[PDB]
Specification:
The structure is cut from a larger assembly and holds two copies of chain A. Chain A is built from one helix and no strands. Chain A is mainly alpha-helical. The PDB classes it as toxin.
Chain lengths: ~50, ~50
Amino acid sequence: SMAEHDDADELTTLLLQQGMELATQSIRIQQRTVDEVDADIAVLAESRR
Amino acid sequence: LELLQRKFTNKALYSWMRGKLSAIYYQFFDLTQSFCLMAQEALRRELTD
């Protein structure tokens, strides 16, 4: 029984670490999206000129 | 998946464990039935029926 519980805990820890690094990559993706929106604003400024 | 395969309680451990238990159960059932039969014979002798 103790071995089973330990193995389950180890699996949970591994899942958490993987989720952490995926979250970091998501941060980067969202920053890139913001940059794209800024570029669109620049295009609009040129058209208005 | 790789972590799951290297677990202490992997598939092989459970398979061997339940196979050994199945063999033990199979023999123990015969032993217990023989014991119950001799107990019934003792009761029959006691009641003379």
